[PDB]
Design a protein around this motif. Sequence first.
Motif, short mmCIF file in Angstrom:
data_model
loop_
_atom_site.label_atom_id
_atom_site.label_comp_id
_atom_site.label_asym_id
_atom_site.label_seq_id
_atom_site.Cartn_x
_atom_site.Cartn_y
_atom_site.Cartn_z
N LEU A 158 0.84 -1.18 0.00
CA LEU A 158 0.00 0.00 0.00
C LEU A 158 0.86 1.22 0.00
O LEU A 158 0.53 2.22 -0.67
CB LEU A 158 -0.97 0.05 1.17
N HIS A 159 1.94 1.16 0.76
CA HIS A 159 2.81 2.32 0.87
C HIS A 159 3.50 2.61 -0.46
O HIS A 159 3.61 3.78 -0.88
CB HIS A 159 3.87 2.19 2.01
N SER A 160 3.93 1.55 -1.15
CA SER A 160 4.67 1.66 -2.42
C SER A 160 3.77 2.16 -3.56
O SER A 160 4.20 2.89 -4.47
CB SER A 160 5.29 0.32 -2.78
N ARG A 161 2.50 1.78 -3.46
CA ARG A 161 1.50 2.30 -4.38
C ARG A 161 1.28 3.81 -4.25
O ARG A 161 1.22 4.49 -5.25
CB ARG A 161 0.18 1.56 -4.18
N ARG A 162 1.13 4.30 -3.02
CA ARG A 162 1.02 5.74 -2.81
C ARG A 162 2.30 6.43 -3.31
O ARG A 162 2.23 7.46 -4.01
CB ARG A 162 0.74 6.06 -1.32
N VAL A 163 3.47 5.86 -2.97
CA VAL A 163 4.76 6.42 -3.42
C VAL A 163 4.83 6.44 -4.94
O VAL A 163 5.03 7.48 -5.53
CB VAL A 163 6.00 5.73 -2.71
N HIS A 177 2.44 6.38 -7.09
CA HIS A 177 1.41 7.23 -7.62
C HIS A 177 1.96 8.65 -7.55
O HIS A 177 1.89 9.38 -8.52
CB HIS A 177 0.15 7.08 -6.76
N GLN A 178 2.53 9.03 -6.41
CA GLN A 178 3.05 10.40 -6.24
C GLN A 178 4.16 10.66 -7.24
O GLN A 178 4.28 11.73 -7.78
CB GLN A 178 3.56 10.61 -4.83
N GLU A 234 2.75 11.54 -10.62
CA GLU A 234 2.29 12.93 -10.65
C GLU A 234 3.45 13.86 -10.80
O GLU A 234 3.42 14.75 -11.64
CB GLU A 234 1.57 13.34 -9.35
N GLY A 275 3.09 -2.97 -5.29
CA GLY A 275 2.37 -1.72 -5.06
C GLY A 275 2.59 -0.82 -6.28
O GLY A 275 1.68 -0.06 -6.66
N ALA A 311 -0.35 0.61 -8.69
CA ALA A 311 -0.46 2.01 -9.07
C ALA A 311 -0.56 2.24 -10.59
O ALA A 311 -1.36 3.05 -11.03
CB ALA A 311 0.67 2.78 -8.51
N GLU A 346 -3.98 3.27 -12.71
CA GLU A 346 -3.93 4.52 -13.44
C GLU A 346 -4.12 4.25 -14.97
O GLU A 346 -3.94 5.15 -15.82
CB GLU A 346 -2.59 5.16 -13.07
#
Lengths: 291, 290
Positions: A168-173, A175-176, A179, A197, A201, A205
């Motif tokens: 989950l953490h690597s997905r947010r990372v 994703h960021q 961006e 993750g 992501a 996307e």
Amino acid sequence: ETYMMITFQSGMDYWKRCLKGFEDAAQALNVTVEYRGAAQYDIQEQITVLEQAIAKNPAGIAISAIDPVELTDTINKAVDAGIPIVLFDSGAPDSHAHSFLGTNNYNAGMNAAYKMAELLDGEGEVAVITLPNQLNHQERTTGFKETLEAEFPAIEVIAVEDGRGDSLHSRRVAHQLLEDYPNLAGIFATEANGGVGVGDAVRLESRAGEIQIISFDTDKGTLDLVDEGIISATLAQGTWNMGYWSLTYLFHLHHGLTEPQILQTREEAPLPLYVDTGITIVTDENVDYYY
Amino acid sequence: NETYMMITFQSGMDYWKRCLKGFEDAAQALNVTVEYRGAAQYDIQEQITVLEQAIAKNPAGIAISAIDPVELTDTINKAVDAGIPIVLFDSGAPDSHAHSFLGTNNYNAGMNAAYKMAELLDGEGEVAVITLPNQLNHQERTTGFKETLEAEFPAIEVIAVEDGRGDSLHSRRVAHQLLEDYPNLAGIFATEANGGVGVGDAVRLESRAGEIQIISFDTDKGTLDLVDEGIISATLAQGTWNMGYWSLTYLFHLHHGLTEPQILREEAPLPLYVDTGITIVTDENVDYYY
């Protein structure tokens, strides 16, 4: 005559092929094996397990050290007790163990750099998702980065980030990162949970495979992502080799089949220092054989 | 008649004897035969021919120390294309399709020399290196030694690296001139046995026989004598028995298909590299190396 394998996060799938090599050598050699490990990712629990192994005084011990330094005093204890002991998968370079059998993590990162350059035609922006405080992941990341700076000046490493060993953490990372970096072309995850993750992501996307992704190891989730066209490649470590050759090396030591080198201290170095057990690139081409 | 061949160059030199001991030790246990062959001289074309003849013999496997990292690759690949297990030992051929390499990690051997020099010097002083500038195995030792000094030991500066040419007399001239040029020189690392002998002898001729720390390579008798006579501080011994024993053991595994190989759809049956080790030898252990 029983040889013991000692791990950490002991129930994890990665160890199953390590153990299999270990039992293949032992079947070959007509000896017994016992599997043990810390159930969690906990240093003091692995110390207890190793301490407990030493107390049974087996014919030899193969251990993947949870930490390169904080297990050393216990490893040397085995050595001091006259038990054959080798490191596999993760080492402890300052310890007195008789060999280390596993991945050359710098070269692993170098292998990933060449594979990346091939997927990107020699140019583009890339990121790394790694574990910044673990030494094997640091070498992976340095091998990758240094290989690209040296051989591929048109590919640029724009971020190295911490995936915390957590999907989950690597997905947010990830994703960021997508961006922040419009032209990001490729992502190397040095750690399996990081890659999963990163794959979630990219697929969330709708970007499978616009974004090239290289991950590590052969967990089922990693292989499913590769078989599905999401993750481009995964680096498979020579886990069977670790097990088969660790056992073999322990057996030789136990039966005194080597002619040891003699140290300044007049102690014996009965084995090679290091066995590079290899790295295999796994893509859809070969994914099948890895399940 | 299951036969494993070991192929060397300057095949009669003392270096190889312990490799062959190792090879023979593994064969004896496995009940297989060995043959020892080689270029009797330091001659590239000669070793190629020796290897072409070994290939023609269709052995159960070949272990070879390549005289040159490049010039033997096409022949090595012929063995590979002929379906003969082949491993490199001692001196590699990184670009060939050979099954594994068993040998020293020279960069690391240089690093080990650096740590031991550092200890000998209490971590400070001027040191020089005597090496073979155009040989890759010697470049690696020099680099490993320098970059370990750079990074870990700021107060030790190597003030010169000099070409010893594999000739002692030249290395003597070099050590002597080094001793004149650098009054405060505390240490010398020679990456090559003949340089080490030349350095040793110059140091005793100048009666510096323990105020210059000397590290050498290998276990030639000339070297071990100087260690026992307190002239050479340490020498780095390669794991040559290891090389022979584990090469034989690996070829036997290849020949019988005893490993579970990793795919690509072509199989990779052996660990790529076995680091056979380097041992620091001083007057404290020198006796075991004769």
